[PDB]
């Protein structure tokens, strides 16, 4: 089913963007935690 196939593809797109934000979320938090300590 074509519609089914597009949906599966979007899931991969939405899951990639969220893994990039989570890695950007840990990166930003850590830099904030480092500056505040020092």
């Amino acid at each position: 089913s074509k519609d089914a196939e597009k949906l599966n593809d979007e899931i991969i797109s939405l899951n990639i963007e969220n893994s990039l934000l989570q890695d950007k979320l840990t990166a930003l938090q850590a830099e904030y935690d480092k500056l505040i300590q020092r």
């Binding site: 074509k2 597009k6 593809d9 979007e10 991969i12 797109s13 899951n15 990639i16 963007e17 893994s19 990039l20 934000l21 890695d23 950007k24």
Partner: protein
């Protein structure tokens, strides 16, 4: 200038066109509509955005440079079309020459023949490929489906005798395991490489010979690679630009600096099959979708987008079905 630099989507759903006026527009084949339009990021008239590869039908895009030199060699942006926002911004030690994606692996090709392999779920670099570090430019191609398989042209063992050569290397990017090294299939350089969507087949294009060789990709015997077939060039040697493989792997399309677009059939289930006439000094790009094997989508720098039909049993030319015009 002309509306140059067309880009074609894996699934033949849509294409990328850099309008020389402003930015870069992206259209959609059914129904045809302005899917995405990048805004002004310009300062002079003939400075061009070079590299765009996209996902299948999603909102995720890979964009590279805008300026002639300000931020080109070392940039790669990942943007959502629906919110126009940049997510991750990667930097690379050399100039990008090509970008290919699939559903699992993103490859970035550098000018220094380095190939960067990323797991797309988390953007971790899997392996750095020093091709020129071992021994025109490197031509790379990639499977569309999962079990994505990477194919690149590597130099031969005659670097002492002369500076330039081209053999082929089959690489499984999924496990980062090299599968098969093909010898010099050509006495010349490799101009363009196309890999099948299921990753089982591969074509090779020479600059002098202009004779396409098709090799088995993975299932080929370890002792020696298996050559499938060869195709008649025509009346005149011509440089080849882009090739594509049909979803049932029965059909191969070839386009270039020639008057015509050739169609090759496959013996998996000879010289020439379906030919589409094309205007001479104007460049075109190929594609065909997954719904049917009789429809071939055609992208043109003249402003015209064409959809041709394929004659299964006739050596006659292709038949036009649907057409539309650019912006």
């Amino acid at each position: 200038m002309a509306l140059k630099l067309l880009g074609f989507n894996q699934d033949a759903t849509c294409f990328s066109v850099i309008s020389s006026n402003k930015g870069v527009t992206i259209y959609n084949c059914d129904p045809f509509g302005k899917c995405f339009e990048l805004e002004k990021s310009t300062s002079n008239d003939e400075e061009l955005d070079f590299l765009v590869e996209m996902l299948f039908s999603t909102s995720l895009i890979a964009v590279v440079d805008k300026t002639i030199g300000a931020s080109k060699r070392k940039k790669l942006k990942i943007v959502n079309t629906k919110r126009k926002a940049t997510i991750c911004e990667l930097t690379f030690p050399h100039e990008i020459m090509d970008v290919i994606m699939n559903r699992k692996i993103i490859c970035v090709v550098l000018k220094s023949d380095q190939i960067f392999v990323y797991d797309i779920s988390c953007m971790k670099l899997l392996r750095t490929i020093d091709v020129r570090g071992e021994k025109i430019g490197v031509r790379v191609s990639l499977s569309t489906d999962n079990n994505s398989i990477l194919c690149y042209s590597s130099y031969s063992k005659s670097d002492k005798e002369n500076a330039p050569l081209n053999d082929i290397v089959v690489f499984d990017a999924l496990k980062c395991i090299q599968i098969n090294v093909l010898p010099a299939v050509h006495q010349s350089n490799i101009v363009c490489i196309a890999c099948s969507p299921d990753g089982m087949l591969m074509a090779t294009a020479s600059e002098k010979g202009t004779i396409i060789r098709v090799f088995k990709t993975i299932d080929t015997e370890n002792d020696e690679p298996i050559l499938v077939n060869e195709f008649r060039r025509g009346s005149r040697p011509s440089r080849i630009s882009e090739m594509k493989f049909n979803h049932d792997n029965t059909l191969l399309a070839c386009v270039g600096e020639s008057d015509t677009i050739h169609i090759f059939a496959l013996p998996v289930t000879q010289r020439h099959v379906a030919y589409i006439k094309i205007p001479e000094n104007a460049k075109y790009r190929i594609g065909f979708p997954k719904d049917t094997t009789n429809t071939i989508h055609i992208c043109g720098e003249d402003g015209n987008y064409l959809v041709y039909s394929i004659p299964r049993n006739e050596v006659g030319p292709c038949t036009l079905v649907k057409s539309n015009t650019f912006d």
